Amino acid sequence: IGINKVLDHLAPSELIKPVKSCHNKPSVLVLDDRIVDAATKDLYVNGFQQNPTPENLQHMFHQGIEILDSARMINVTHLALWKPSSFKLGNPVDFALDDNYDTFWQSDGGQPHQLDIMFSKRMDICVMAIFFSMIADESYAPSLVKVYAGHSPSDARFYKMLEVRNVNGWVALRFLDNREDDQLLKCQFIRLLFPVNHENGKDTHLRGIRLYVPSAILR
Amino acid sequence: VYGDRYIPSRTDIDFNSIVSISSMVEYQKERQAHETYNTLLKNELFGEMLSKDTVGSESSIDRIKNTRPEITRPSSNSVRGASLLTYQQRKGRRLSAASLLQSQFFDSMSPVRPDSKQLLLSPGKQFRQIAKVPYRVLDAPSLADDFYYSLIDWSSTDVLAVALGKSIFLTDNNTGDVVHLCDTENEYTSLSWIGAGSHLAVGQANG
């Protein structure tokens, strides 16, 4: 009887399906920084605020990095393979992951720009950190972003929507919809899309990007 | 060893086979890519008749290119091409010599015919004209658009003088910025420089 009961446990159907009344529309996340809320404060780190000067942006860029690294956390941004849609022979993704505001990465090619993040081993991402500069890079500012998820390039699937209006700072996105029990994302394949820029732009930069995961002597 | 004229020998290639053989911006690049693939395919798939034919030097690729219906040296000048019947060909083989064992050796590592390998290894011409959309555009709001006007002008110092509206702006290519020179009540129509960029001769709308 042990075989029969475990089979029910692996695949509960009558217990699981409540009404099967899903709305099936894609949920959209609001990123605006003019409204103060507890949920927004959790995802927006730098704080709600004329347009600051670029050096002020560089200063807040470092303070955002320090605050994100201040908490107990493990950075594995360099523990994965990256393959953007196309280069421009001026700046590879290294200057995007160099944690420097002055340097940045630029793609050049088709309008739906793609950024690939491949992982070697099953890593459980909890917080994804991305930095935007609306006033500094208004021409190449990312306006709409769609984040995918999957275990392979084969099974990439939609996760979340992100609309950009005015965000001149680091953006933190912890994942809770997928798994409420773990409060983290478990995947080996993450890809990002930038289908259109602000004011009908063509290309897109990426100032910063980071990935966050949880975990006498003789010299 | 030489076939008679009145009684020619028949090659294995058939009437319609020659009908097959003789059949023929990124668009130019793709068309060139398609043609070499087609020529290579018909060269490799055929050529057993061509290998049995020929008398000396030359190549099966040259025979196919000669069929009517940076360049390297052509070997021989024969343009016989495909043919149903051959007169000169009577079955004969040269004795094996050290060059032949050298040749059969460089062939041992080749999955295709040496002639096809030479055709592929030959470099295609990289001769194209690129006149496409501009690679850089800067800012110059409110530019004059009168038929009797000629505003922009090159200078040897990577310096451009523009009459934007009623003020003269300076664009430096080495810096990529805009510098304002002066302005007046009447709009400018013509711009010029005297010497080596030392002076700027500008014409107004009233002479």
């Binding site: 021409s139 190449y140 820029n197 004011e199 009908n200 732009g201 063509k202 | 555009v137 800067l138 800012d139």
Partner: peptide, 6 residues
């Protein structure tokens, strides 16, 4: 500025 719109 580039990024010229149609």
């Amino acid at each position: 500025l580039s990024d010229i719109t149609n």
